[PDB]
Design an enzyme around this catalytic site. Structure first.
Site, PDB file in Angstrom:
ATOM      1  CG  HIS A  43      -0.424   0.411   2.485  1.00  9.58           C
ATOM      2  ND1 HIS A  43      -1.103   1.242   3.353  1.00  9.58           N
ATOM      3  CD2 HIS A  43       0.777   0.165   3.062  1.00  9.58           C
ATOM      4  CE1 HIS A  43      -0.358   1.459   4.423  1.00  9.58           C
ATOM      5  NE2 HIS A  43       0.786   0.814   4.275  1.00  9.58           N
ATOM      6  CB  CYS A  97       2.941   3.247   5.695  1.00 10.55           C
ATOM      7  SG  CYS A  97       2.897   1.689   6.552  1.00 10.55           S
ATOM      8  CD  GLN A 115      -6.677   1.449  10.560  1.00  7.67           C
ATOM      9  OE1 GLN A 115      -5.692   2.050  10.147  1.00  7.67           O
ATOM     10  NE2 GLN A 115      -7.673   2.053  11.194  1.00  7.67           N
ATOM     11  CB  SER A 138      -3.668   4.865   8.853  1.00  6.59           C
ATOM     12  OG  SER A 138      -3.859   3.648   9.534  1.00  6.59           O
ATOM     13  CG  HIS A 141      -4.728   2.903   3.148  1.00 11.26           C
ATOM     14  ND1 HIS A 141      -3.588   2.603   3.865  1.00 11.26           N
ATOM     15  CD2 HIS A 141      -5.665   3.260   4.056  1.00 11.26           C
ATOM     16  CE1 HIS A 141      -3.837   2.727   5.157  1.00 11.26           C
ATOM     17  NE2 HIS A 141      -5.085   3.150   5.300  1.00 11.26           N
TER      18      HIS A 141
END
Ligand SMILES: CC(=O)Nc1ccccc1F
Length: 147
Positions: A43, A97, A115, A138, A141
């Site tokens: 991702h 990330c 998630q 977060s 993505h």
């Protein structure tokens, strides 16, 4: 008809039918092709000021808005789809990330670990397929299912 998750849509600009997946946020012109115990995904994460942790290896304080983050995601998706850039290249450079150091690779995982919007998109993607923007606590993505 249509595999589940997929619906028919019409381009506002051309009038041609396309297909949209409301689990992966993917869209494509072709009628879609069609669950494993585990999948493997990479991702590219773009965080924003409301991210659960608004910090990353790229920036100690992430201040961009959710709208700015979606613009950045959208741009990366365009360059990946055009072939101007590779997913792995953009993740390495711009993913907020820690997996950026691994070209975005998260390794393999089961249901229950990630998630939920990420998990659902990951498991709904076909092998080799890329998501549209997928939203989690977060951030935003781009998900690439590799296995
Ligand atoms: C080890 C690997 O495959 N990916 C990875 C590397 C650093 C942080 C997070 C990660 F998911």
């Amino acid at each position: 008809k249509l595999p589940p998750g997929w619906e028919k849509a019409m381009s506002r600009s051309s009038g041609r039918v396309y297909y949209f997946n409301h689990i992966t946020n993917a869209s494509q012109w072709e009628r879609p092709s069609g669950e494993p115990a585990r999948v493997r995904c990479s991702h590219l994460l773009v965080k924003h000021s409301q991210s659960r942790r608004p910090s990353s290896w790229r920036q100690e304080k992430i201040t961009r808005t959710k709208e700015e983050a979606l613009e950045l995601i959208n741009g990366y998706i365009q360059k990946i789809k055009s072939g101007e850039e590779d997913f792995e290249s953009l993740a390495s450079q711009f993913s907020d990330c820690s997996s950026a150091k691994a070209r975005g690779d998260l390794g393999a995982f089961s249901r229950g670990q990630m998630q939920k919007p990420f998990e659902d998109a990951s498991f709904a993607l076909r092998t080799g397929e890329m998501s549209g923007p997928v939203f989690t606590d977060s951030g935003i993505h781009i998900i690439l299912r590799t296995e």
